[PDB]
């Protein structure tokens, strides 16, 4: 039920950070180099 749905949750609320995932530029540049395959894409497959 919609009442049963609200019973499951009426309105539950939303739930060292400079380095916990700081390696972002690495995979970023990896992808910036890797996009070349799709950039070329001589024939779809």
């Amino acid at each position: 039920d919609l009442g049963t749905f609200y019973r499951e949750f009426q309105n539950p609320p939303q739930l060292s950070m400079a380095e916990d995932l700081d390696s972002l530029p690495e995979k970023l540049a990896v992808h910036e180099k890797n996009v070349r395959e799709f950039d070329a894409f001589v024939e779809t497959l």
Binding site: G3, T4, N11, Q14, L15
Partner: protein
Amino acid sequence: MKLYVFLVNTGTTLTFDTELTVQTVADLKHAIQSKYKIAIQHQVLVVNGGECMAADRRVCTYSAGTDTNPIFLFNKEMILCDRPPAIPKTTFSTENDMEIKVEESLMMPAVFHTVASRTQLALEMYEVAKKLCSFCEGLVHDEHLQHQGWAAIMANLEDCSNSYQKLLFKFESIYSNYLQSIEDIKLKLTHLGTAVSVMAKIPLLECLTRHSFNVSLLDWINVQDRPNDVESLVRKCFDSMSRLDPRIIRPFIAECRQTIAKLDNQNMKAIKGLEDRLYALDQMIASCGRLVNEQKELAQGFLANQKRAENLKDASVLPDLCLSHANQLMIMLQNHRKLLDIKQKCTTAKQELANNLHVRLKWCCFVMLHADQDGEKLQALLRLVIELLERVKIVEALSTVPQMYCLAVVEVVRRKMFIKHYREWAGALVKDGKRLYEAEKSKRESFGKLFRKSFLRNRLFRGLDSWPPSFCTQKPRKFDCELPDISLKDLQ
């Protein structure tokens, strides 16, 4: 033992094991669901004065599911509907279709069966007639129990309207306080940005050191929780104002908000004219029972009529093979069907009156559904409005920044200054005191240690046997008493 009392809600008999008290009320729904199609969310019914029950544990704790508990609830299997039957009596018509002394003797000389007759088949017919009479009695009793359940239902409706009244009292606030909220939340939406700006204006380097570098204090306040916004309270207050539109202010925004005012009250609660008719039904049943008890025997008096026929022993008993000799018993032989139908008349009348009662029950169930699961929405909404008032209060805590930060800085600075000055003066005074302690007291202590045996006994030269108290000569503790690492200058 299990309840011979049947289920009022269905007005019909059923059974279950007596140890069902441990089974939950939702387990009771499963039991009434295996057949009759109950569900964990089947009806708007509640327990006691319009509230939920502790259904998780054994329903006996909530006095449900017991051995003394037949089925009774909002009766959602049929919307004021049933299949009321009537007494079949064609079997009696068969007996009436052959209402004569049997042909086993076939008009032989009267010595034939001179000590026997059709009394037993007549006895069987009359006893079965009485059986149908008691059957109608039980059926009428079933309809009456159904009426009792309907009364219990009207009572639950009253309890519900009470819950409605409580929710309305909330709604009174969720109107009046909501009307009062027309200013608080707006201001709570109003000054919070200014407070956040004032807080961010002087984000302390101590605050920069707090988690142990600049950062936004209001955001530092905001991000202090992952989902918190430096004007989360302001946003929620303005949103509540938006949700405070006049259609919500309608006297039945939740249609219940006036449905309870009008239908479940205000002379529209027909339950006032309910119970007596059920009593009138019980009276009709009792009168029918008065008419129908022992009546088949009253017509078919075979026990005495047997000896009556024996005394008769007509020399011309040929016409006596018909109903003329069998008088009132023979009368019963065709009147059993009539009595059965007469009983069925009041029985089906009770069934249809119960249908009408369930009809008015659904009539009230209109405003019921308007409240249960429709105005209950407004109920949780008012709980939310209360949460919004709390959010406004928190917004004030955000407003508490503009003076709170300056007060903390100034008080901590002045306190650290006073603490330093006082600790230094305390140490210096304790030092002067220890200096006195040495110069006079310790010198005297040495002279007295020498004065061991200066007189032949202690009391002889008694005096200055010790130094002064010497308390308060130790050093003071550390100034500001080990405060949190927030540096006042870093606050400055």
